[PDB]
Amino acid sequence: SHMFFEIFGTGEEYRYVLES
Amino acid sequence: MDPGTVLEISRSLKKRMQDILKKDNANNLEGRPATGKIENVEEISDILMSKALQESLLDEGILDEIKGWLEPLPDKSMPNIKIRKRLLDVLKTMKIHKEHLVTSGVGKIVYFYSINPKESKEVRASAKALVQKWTNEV
Ligand SMILES: [Br-]
Numbered sequence A: 001s002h003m004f005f006e007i008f009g010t011g012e013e014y015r016y017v018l019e020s
Numbered sequence B: 001m002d003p004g005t006v007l008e009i010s011r012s013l014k015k016r017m018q019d020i021l022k023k024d025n026a027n028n029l030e031g032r033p034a035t036g037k038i039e040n041v042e043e044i045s046d047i048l049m050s051k052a053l054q055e056s057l058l059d060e061g062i063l064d065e066i067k068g069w070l071e072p073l074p075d076k077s078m079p080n081i082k083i084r085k086r087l088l089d090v091l092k093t094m095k096i097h098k099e100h101l102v103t104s105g106v107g108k109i110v111y112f113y114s115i116n117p118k119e120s121k122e123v124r125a126s127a128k129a130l131v132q133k134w135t136n137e138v
Helices: A003-008 B003-029 B036-048 B054-059 B062-070 B081-093 B098-104 B106-115 B121-137
Strands: none
Touching (some): A003 B098, A003 B121, B003 B036, B003 B054, B036 B081, B062 B098, B098 B106
């Protein structure tokens, strides 16, 4: 797995806040 | 200054950030205002910005706690804007290495701030700049 993904994830981790 | 005492100071601040976050989240779970991070952010940010403590704070995993303070509350609301602005400014000053980012995952919450449409223009800009900084560096 790429370093960028280790650090920033997929960029969807907190998207549930918006959908709230 | 004794490096054992520095380490004590760092671990003390880490526990203090942990305890404040826990109490805030428990209040939120119980439907009560969270006030602890708000009450303490300016003093705690001053300590997080102590040049003599920064290597040690980062060594002691302080990005875990910063990340927690930035994360949504149990009700899915975001912490008070005073915390959002101030901790982004703190993070900007820290000499954060690739490894610190990997282990803490603070990059994930900061990236969310950078793309959150409901965030203030100023905080979103700061979060974008931190993402860019941490990319530039890595
Ligand atoms: Br808060």
